[PDB]
């Protein structure tokens, strides 16, 4: 499922994914939690993102 970033996000660790507002991100894993594993359709990188920064697209 594809979500779209509502805000910019700047990563702070090894495992999260930076992204820009409007970037489209594929869900890799959102089975549970506030942090989701996502895959960017702009960069192709995969990492954890804050779920409250994205909405379905």
Swiss-Prot record:
It comes from Gallus gallus (Chicken). This is Proto-oncogene tyrosine-protein kinase Src. It is found in: Cell membrane; Mitochondrion inner membrane; Endosome membrane; Nucleus. The chain holds residues 85 to 140 of 533 of the full protein. The phosphorylated form is termed pp60c-src. S-nitrosylation is important for activation of its kinase activity. It comes from the Eukaryota. Forms a complex with polyoma virus middle T antigen. Interacts with AFAP-110. Interacts with GJA1 and PXN. Non-receptor protein tyrosine kinase which is activated following engagement of many different classes of cellular receptors including immune response receptors, integrins and other adhesion receptors, receptor protein tyrosine kinases, G protein-coupled receptors as well as cytokine receptors. Participates in signaling pathways that control a diverse spectrum of biological activities including gene transcription, immune response, cell adhesion, cell cycle progression, apoptosis, migration, and transformation. Residues 2-57 form the SH3 domain.
